[PDB]
Design a protein around this ligand. Structure first.
Ligand SMILES: [Mg+2]
Ligand SMILES: [Mg+2]
Ligand SMILES: [Mg+2]
Ligand SMILES: [Mg+2]
Ligand SMILES: [Mg+2]
Ligand SMILES: [Mg+2]
Ligand SMILES: [Mg+2]
Ligand SMILES: [Mg+2]
Ligand SMILES: [Mg+2]
Ligand SMILES: [Mg+2]
Ligand SMILES: [Mg+2]
Ligand SMILES: [Mg+2]
Ligand SMILES: [Mg+2]
Ligand SMILES: [Mg+2]
Ligand SMILES: [Mg+2]
Ligand SMILES: [Mg+2]
Ligand SMILES: [Mg+2]
Ligand SMILES: [Mg+2]
Ligand SMILES: [Mg+2]
Ligand SMILES: [Mg+2]
Ligand SMILES: [Mg+2]
Ligand SMILES: [Mg+2]
Ligand SMILES: [Mg+2]
Ligand SMILES: [Mg+2]
Ligand SMILES: [Mg+2]
Ligand SMILES: [Mg+2]
Ligand SMILES: [Mg+2]
Ligand SMILES: [Mg+2]
Ligand SMILES: [Mg+2]
Ligand SMILES: [Mg+2]
Ligand SMILES: [Mg+2]
Ligand SMILES: [Mg+2]
Ligand SMILES: [Mg+2]
Ligand SMILES: [Mg+2]
Ligand SMILES: [Mg+2]
Ligand SMILES: [Mg+2]
Ligand SMILES: [Mg+2]
Ligand SMILES: [Mg+2]
Ligand SMILES: [Mg+2]
Ligand SMILES: [Mg+2]
Ligand SMILES: [Mg+2]
Ligand SMILES: [Mg+2]
Ligand SMILES: [Mg+2]
Ligand SMILES: [Mg+2]
Ligand SMILES: [Mg+2]
Ligand SMILES: [Mg+2]
Ligand SMILES: [Mg+2]
Ligand SMILES: [Mg+2]
Lengths: 122, 94, 96, 85
RNA sequence: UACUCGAGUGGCGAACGGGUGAGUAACACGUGGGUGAUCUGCCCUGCACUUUGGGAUAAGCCUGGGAAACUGGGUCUAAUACCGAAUACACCCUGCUGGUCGCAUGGCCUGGUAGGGGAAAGCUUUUGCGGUGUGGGAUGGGCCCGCGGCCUAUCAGCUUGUUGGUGGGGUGAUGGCCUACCAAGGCGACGACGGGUAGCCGGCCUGAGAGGGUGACCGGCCACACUGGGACUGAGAUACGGCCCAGACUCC
């Protein structure tokens, strides 16, 4: 690109491929569950995972992934959601923190307790 | 301790009022002329010098300036919307 | 009448007061035309330094200092110099 | 209005508007009469009206209703119109 | 009794300081001039004067309306509240005559000349403070100036007080600030006007660097005050807790 072309056109930088559209730039959004169901990951990995469809304060319909092993989520349960991709599920881009609001951390966890929100032993 | 009505205010002389030079382009005015200035500058990022011209218009009450002539400028009083620059003296005509 | 102010900056638990000659019309932290020093009581000596010549020129040009500023100027002896009564008295306790 | 100081200020401002409107209307009537004399086209009566109007204009300006340089401005403009006609 | 004081004027102060960023791409912002085109109380500092007569109103008392806020009618009292006149002749304007500078009308030597015009208020007898004009200066301010400072031509022509002249009106100050008439132009592909975005900057994060992002606090400016407008007061109004009108909100 010659100098005159540079002056004529200006150099345009990449437009960011923004991910995690739901929070619209927020580190957190609060939502209410609409359904609880299961889905089958892509061909390389087959399983039966648990995903929840939640209504957001930002009025966006996006599924979220259910961590841990056991959950107490039934339809119309206020929940908390964070940002994170998931490759096994193609239409999933969100997690659901445990130990906050009505979602508690699965019992019997002592390793990586902080990530799932569990208390100590006594 | 009397004293007349002679407690004045501060002084201020006259200093530098903008002076420039350029070429006249449109003479179809009446006792008014528009001039263009040639200046050089380098891009803040590229480092390549840049030669761009801005649009200006001066004053003449008699219109002795023809199309395509070089003139000098002195900032006079605001006299019309968008026009405040007044010609001092002609440097050449064509 | 531009008065000798004490510009303030910094944080809460340690205020700062720079000696500024400015008009009282602006904010307390507003336009500072000329700075001649600062004043801070947080330190026990609370050392203060004054430029006698600039202070005197401002006084003669028409800036009336505020009462604490004038008192501190007497302490530094600048008021004594301007009055010419006792002369120039140096008693400031330079910090140990 | 919720403070005694501000309410008192509003009272005082209304009083001084009554006063200033009176004075300014008088000045405007003087200038209007001068204008009427000029577009009628008289000389000596025009000059006498100039005298009276200038005296009252200066009185008002010194009182502070209007401002000195502009007072000189319209007085000298009127003198210029008179000398022109 | 005045030690003292409710309120009552009169002032002065209230345009301070504190808050917020919705709009705003603009001389809105940083820096650089400015003005022989403006003002500016309260501060100091050299330098004339402050004679004189008059009247009214609040407050108060009475009456009346009205829950109310609020209001009127009548009597009465004073003034750093008010106005006339005395002068001014150094200041503001106009018709006649030199030198300096040139960056031009013209400025300065208060250049000389004839006319006419114009201001004040007292308080304390003690580190004594007040009023009016302007040769000296400062500050706060206004105007406009080169440059600059998002993205979108899948926004290309826009603009009629719009663009300039003359004349009037207008401003603290030149100017379409406003008016009338003349000419048809001015702005436009070295991106006009259009659309979405968003207070600007000294700065904060990053990067060796250029550069990218960004505007937390502090601070320099800007704009805003339930939404839309307008005006009075003065040296100083976008007048946040100043005024009026219209809508919404809440309440009596
Ligand atoms: Mg003097
Ligand atoms: Mg003076
Ligand atoms: Mg200046
Ligand atoms: Mg402030
Ligand atoms: Mg000490
Ligand atoms: Mg004290
Ligand atoms: Mg209340
Ligand atoms: Mg009237
Ligand atoms: Mg009328
Ligand atoms: Mg006045
Ligand atoms: Mg004029
Ligand atoms: Mg004229
Ligand atoms: Mg009392
Ligand atoms: Mg005040
Ligand atoms: Mg006010
Ligand atoms: Mg205010
Ligand atoms: Mg703040
Ligand atoms: Mg906030
Ligand atoms: Mg805003
Ligand atoms: Mg713009
Ligand atoms: Mg400037
Ligand atoms: Mg003032
Ligand atoms: Mg008298
Ligand atoms: Mg009475
Ligand atoms: Mg008496
Ligand atoms: Mg008199
Ligand atoms: Mg006299
Ligand atoms: Mg005379
Ligand atoms: Mg003389
Ligand atoms: Mg008096
Ligand atoms: Mg400039
Ligand atoms: Mg610039
Ligand atoms: Mg004209
Ligand atoms: Mg003119
Ligand atoms: Mg104009
Ligand atoms: Mg006209
Ligand atoms: Mg904004
Ligand atoms: Mg920087
Ligand atoms: Mg680098
Ligand atoms: Mg770089
Ligand atoms: Mg920025
Ligand atoms: Mg600040
Ligand atoms: Mg700031
Ligand atoms: Mg400024
Ligand atoms: Mg507003
Ligand atoms: Mg306002
Ligand atoms: Mg307020
Ligand atoms: Mg209020």
């Amino acid at each position: 690109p010659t100098i005159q072309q540079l002056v004529r056109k200006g150099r345009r930088d990449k437009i960011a491929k923004v991910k995690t559209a739901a929070l619209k730039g927020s580190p957190q959004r609060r939502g209410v569950c609409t359904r609880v169901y299961t889905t089958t990951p892509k061909k390389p990995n087959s399983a039966l995972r648990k995903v929840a469809r939640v209504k957001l304060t930002s009025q966006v319909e996006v599924t979220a992934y259910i961590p841990g092993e056991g959950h107490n989520l039934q339809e119309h349960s206020m929940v908390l959601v964070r940002g994170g991709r998931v490759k096994d599920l193609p239409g999933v881009r969100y997690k659901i923190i445990r130990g906050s609001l009505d979602t508690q951390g699965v019992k019997n966890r002592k390793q990586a307790r902080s990530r799932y929100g569990a208390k100590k032993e006594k | 301790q009397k004293g007349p009505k002679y407690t004045p205010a501060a002084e201020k002389p006259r200093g530098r009022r903008k002076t420039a030079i350029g070429y006249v382009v449109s003479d179809k005015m009446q006792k008014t002329i528009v001039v263009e200035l040639e200046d050089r500058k380098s891009h803040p990022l590229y480092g390549k010098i840049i030669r761009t011209t801005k649009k200006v218009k001066a004053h003449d009450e008699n219109g002795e300036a023809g199309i395509g002539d070089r003139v000098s400028l002195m900032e006079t009083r605001p006299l019309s919307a968008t026009k405040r620059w007044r010609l001092v003296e002609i440097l050449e005509k064509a | 009448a531009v008065k000798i102010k004490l510009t303030r900056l910094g944080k809460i638990r340690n205020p700062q007061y720079r000696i500024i000659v400015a008009d009282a019309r602006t904010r307390r932290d507003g336009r500072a035309i000329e700075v001649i020093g600062r004043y801070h009581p947080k330190e026990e000596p609370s050392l203060i330094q004054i430029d006698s010549e600039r202070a005197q020129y401002w006084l003669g040009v028409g800036a009336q200092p505020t009462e604490p500023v004038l008192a501190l100027l007497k302490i530094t002896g600048d008021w004594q110099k301007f009055k010419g009564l006792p002369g120039a008295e140096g008693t400031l306790k330079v910090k140990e | 209005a919720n403070i005694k100081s501000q309410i008192k200020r509003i009272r005082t401002n209304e009083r001084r508007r009554l006063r200033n409107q009176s004075v300014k209307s008088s000045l405007r009537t003087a200038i209007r009469g001068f204008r009427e004399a000029v577009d009628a086209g008289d000389k000596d009566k025009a000059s006498e009206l100039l005298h009276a109007t200038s005296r009252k204009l200066d009185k008002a300006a010194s009182k502070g209703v209007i401002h000195p340089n502009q007072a000189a401005n319209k007085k000298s403009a009127l003198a210029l119109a008179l000398n022109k006609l």
